[PDB]
Design a protein around this ligand. Structure first.
Ligand SMILES: [Ca+2]
Ligand SMILES: [Ca+2]
Ligand SMILES: [Ca+2]
Ligand SMILES: [Ca+2]
Lengths: 87, 88
């Protein structure tokens, strides 16, 4: 409804999957896959979900530490936003 | 709510304010001012002249065309998300 509510929702969404393990401020490969399978599905990755998790991990992981922090997550979120904006 | 609903909410929020004039795809100074007032509410109705729009305009208007496009707007949203991720 409000801009702030949406932002908190994005934050809580990320933490739901990131805090699944020891590394609570980042998404592991499996946690991302979990996220990619629920919150946005055939919408985005067109999931052959057992197959194309790896390519997406490498797209987002721009510092190459095998984990997806919130910033890297956000960059993807706002790319989709920027992309969907087309009417 | 899903992520995709929140993304579209942010998109439609920008649109409802950007289309109040003939420049549908950008936010004017007036349109921007109303967005900031509604979305970021200064409860203390005390104005030592509050220019939230002018200071924001300088920060957000990268190309200096005195309009805020969606990408420029998303920069604001990006910063807020990062900040409140520390608050939680
Ligand atoms: Ca994790
Ligand atoms: Ca990383
Ligand atoms: Ca406009
Ligand atoms: Ca501009």
């Amino acid at each position: 409804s409000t801009l702030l509510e949406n932002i908190f929702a994005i934050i809580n969404l990320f933490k739901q999957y990131s805090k699944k393990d020891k590394n609570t401020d980042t998404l592991s490969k499996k946690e991302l896959k979990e996220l990619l399978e629920k919150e946005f599905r055939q919408i985005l990755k067109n999931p052959d979900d057992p197959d194309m998790v790896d390519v997406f991990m490498d797209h987002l992981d721009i510092d190459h530490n095998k984990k997806i922090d919130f910033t890297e997550f956000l960059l993807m979120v706002f790319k989709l936003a920027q992309a969907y904006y087309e009417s």
